């Protein structure tokens, strides 16, 4: 086994945004028929329990380190601002800006990241 775990969570994290914002982006050119139970309640579980162990990776990560391209606070927040926007998403209880804005962020900051772990290298 050979992975850098820290790194592979966050570009699943980045890919599970991608996806969030490119269902919403396209989710009205298609049929798109869903149930909020089957498939979206272990997806919850499993979005929750990544970002609580991303974000305790992270925050070590940074510690261990010293975050100097990504930020802090950005790092608690797309934690938390992620949860919402996997909610939002299927939901469609978000608008418009404010989506995309979010997932920019996470974005953003999961680009940060990737850099800073793969900066120190991992063994």
């Given at each position: 086994?050979?992975?850098?775990?820290?790194?592979?969570?966050?570009?699943?994290?980045?890919?599970?945004?991608?996806?969030?914002?490119?269902?919403?982006?396209?989710?009205?050119?298609?049929?798109?028929?869903?149930?909020?139970?089957?498939?979206?309640?272990?997806?919850?579980?499993?979005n929750?329990?990544?970002?609580?162990?991303?974000?305790?990776?992270?925050?070590?990560?940074?510690?261990?380190?010293?975050?100097?391209?990504?930020?802090?606070?950005?790092?608690?927040?797309?934690?938390?601002?992620?949860?919402?926007?996997?909610?939002?998403?299927?939901?469609?209880?978000?608008?418009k800006?404010?989506?995309?804005?979010?997932?920019?962020?996470?974005?953003?900051?999961?680009?940060?990241?990737?850099?800073?772990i793969?900066?120190?290298?991992?063994?």
């Amino acid at each position: 086994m050979l992975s850098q775990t820290l790194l592979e969570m966050t570009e699943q994290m980045i890919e599970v945004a991608e996806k969030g914002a490119d269902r919403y982006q396209e989710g009205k050119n298609s049929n798109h028929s869903y149930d909020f139970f089957e498939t979206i309640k272990p997806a919850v579980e499993e979005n929750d329990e990544l970002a609580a162990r991303w974000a305790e990776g992270a925050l070590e990560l940074i510690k261990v380190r010293r975050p100097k391209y990504v930020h802090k606070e950005q790092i608690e927040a797309v934690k938390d601002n992620f949860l919402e926007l996997v909610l939002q998403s299927y939901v469609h209880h978000i608008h418009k800006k404010r989506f995309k804005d979010i997932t920019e962020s996470v974005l953003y900051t999961l680009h940060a990241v990737k850099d800073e772990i793969a900066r120190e290298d991992s063994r």
